[model samples]
Target chain A: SPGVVISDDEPGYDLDLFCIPNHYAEDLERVFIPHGLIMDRTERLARDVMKEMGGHHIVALCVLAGGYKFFADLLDYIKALNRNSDRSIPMTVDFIRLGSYCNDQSTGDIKVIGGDDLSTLTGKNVLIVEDIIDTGKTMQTLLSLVRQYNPKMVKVASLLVKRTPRSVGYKPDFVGFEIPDKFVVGYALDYNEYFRDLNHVCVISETGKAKYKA
Target chain B: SPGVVISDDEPGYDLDLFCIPNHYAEDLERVFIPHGLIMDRTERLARDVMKEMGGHHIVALCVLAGGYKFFADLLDYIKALNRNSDRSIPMTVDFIRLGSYCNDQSTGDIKVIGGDDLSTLTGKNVLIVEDIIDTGKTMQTLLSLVRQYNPKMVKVASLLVKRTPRSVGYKPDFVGFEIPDKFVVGYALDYNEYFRDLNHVCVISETGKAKYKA
Candidate 1:
């Protein structure tokens, strides 16, 4: 799991915090996480996507485990925002856990193992709630996959964008922060399933990395 | 969440372990935790249940989170035991994370909230796995719940059985230790979800009872 990084000196520290790298933290910050901060910014993104499709019904796709906590908080916020204004609008919800991680830095393919059926997206809008958008390869690949399901509208919302010097051309409509290169951890980020529970974000040092692997 | 009591000197012991009562080591030998111990002894009991069922093809209802490690290990043991002689008999694997625990104390009024559906049990021989069996209230309710689903067979497999009297006519067909009446913890028991990772069975204190109220 890619998430925020922190050290012993950090306040409100989680002992088992898993840090991928602070660079990932840059991505998470770009996305807004551990809190609904990023969620607050998704209205415009949702509206634009919904307008493009000219459809009212949408199926929000929630990724599981790592995305479970974030997705729940995001839905609650979305519901709250919708309650005050739009009750007539209808949207459906579904979740699935997709798998694809850095086997080594070279970009492995995203493999969606256990997820809901693509038919659920048929004739409905789809907005994927992904934790981070790295090489953009994963999201692009997912969009293509969901396209085969024949959804009416499809867009992506990434809490974090890695902002590599080389752009993938596929940009996330909704993002939290535009971070510089730093390995970050915490907030649904996991370093071997350790820190998904941590609330704050921080960078990882070489010594810290070594200690973690050890 | 059940176990045998520990002595006062046991450091780092929880005040509550699965809403069970704890005792000193001097008294634990005579003390029994039917629910706690039944969960601890998975192998012998599972075998007995399988035998009594005439080696029927069945699916075991494993609860996740608490039962992941136990299920992994027990499945391996069951496979090995089957390979020795009953290898030809087939068994399927399925899981449901039912939430009703304390509330589902009886068949007439049991409530299961978080787990999978009862329909999964339809037409299958079901074996519900729990770590322990106490008043047999929970098991009886679960059995009736399974019966409603119309499973071909419904049996109970528990690691420990507290000789504590059960008012319900139900009894675990396969049970491991017949404990007296002591509150035990450890080995899948918890205090606010603290100690499920431990492999050994121990006990909790009278105050530990407060933790399981929810």
Candidate 2:
């Protein structure tokens, strides 16, 4: 259940609002790409994957919170792809959220918040849309967990993959971008629950990091 | 998703802790069997089914909370069977609770309180353990829902199957007993949430019904 952490305090307010730069454009060390580019790239991956799956219904599971944005856009592309295709494939969409990270690091123990029944996934083709693949621990554990239910096929569609050496040897079936290991936020990725609402994927500046770190 | 109904009311409250009858057994009818007998029969079914499943893992989903008692007993039996057998089948246990009943009648629209992601069940063998299959609406919807995930196979093991004509033409793969539709409670079945904690499945007497109906 890696998802929106609902706490007593409202999100996007832990740090002073005025502390946020008026022009994050200058604050970000690098804005790898705009939202449109990532989404268009995702659509292509989803379209190709859906076609490869043939006529079977794809059970698309969004790995909650982080994957929400990616999943929504990808699903739209998948539907659009199906609508335009001669052979339209049916799709079943759902959510499975897991929590393991504490601050910026993983706790090593994964906990599921909203997960589907094992029966619902017994023999279908499945697509897991994830936000990022960092340490690979979550992906590995998630893959194994999904495997126990016995899917006919399992594939991963991720928005980002940090180029750092993986703790677990796992690679996404579909990847949007490969980038250097840096603290990233925005476009559904958050740094202490901030910047997720921002349009572009951004790297926090040294000053921004110092100011925002809780 | 179909299950025993749990309510916010106490059940059958007349027969005191110190009832007058020395062996009130005379007040009971002989129609219902003891819990142990039903459990023993369920174990036999589990044994045969496990053998039929061969050596693969079976994703067993309990339709809670009605199936809770039956599920626990059946799981134990399956484990015991595996322990005593040369070829043991591994089992994956999970739960899915459905809420659509309006006091023993189907509301027709099924709402899933807890369900598995369709992706998790894509290519696995699934065994749904249910407390009863009465009108068949729930069973039909449940089977169809599970099938959408594309399971390798789907089977149902129901503790009871009322002999009355089904509203929907559906039947269980394995049934414990076929009985005339009667208000049955106990061993996890309830009448206004009462009698579920009882060890025996029994027909509620008219007097008891009057006392328990919420």
Candidate 1 per-residue C-alpha lDDT over A65-115 given as tens digits, one digit per residue, 9 for 90 to 100: 333444444444443333233332344555544545622245546665445
Candidate 2 ranges with C-alpha deviation above 4 Å: A1-27, A105-107, B1-112, B115-214
Q: How well does each candidate superpose onto the true structure, as a TM-score?
A: 0.43, 0.46
Index of the highest-TM-score prediction: 2
Q: Write the per-residue lDDT of candidate 2 for residues A1-214, one digit (tens) a residue.
A: 1111112222223222223323343445555446666767777776677767877866777665332456656765664554344545555554556643625544467767555444566688887877877777667777878888898888887787766644465767777776556777656576643454354666676776766666
lDDT of 2 at A68: 48
lDDT by residue (B109-214, candidate 1, tens digit) is 4455434445656776777776666676655655655555577877666655666554454566655555554565544443333333223355544554544455
For model 2 chain B, the run of ten residues with the poorest summed lDDT: B16-25
Off by over 4 Å in 1: A1-55, A102-104, B1-214
What does the TM-score come to for chain B in model 2?
A: 0.79
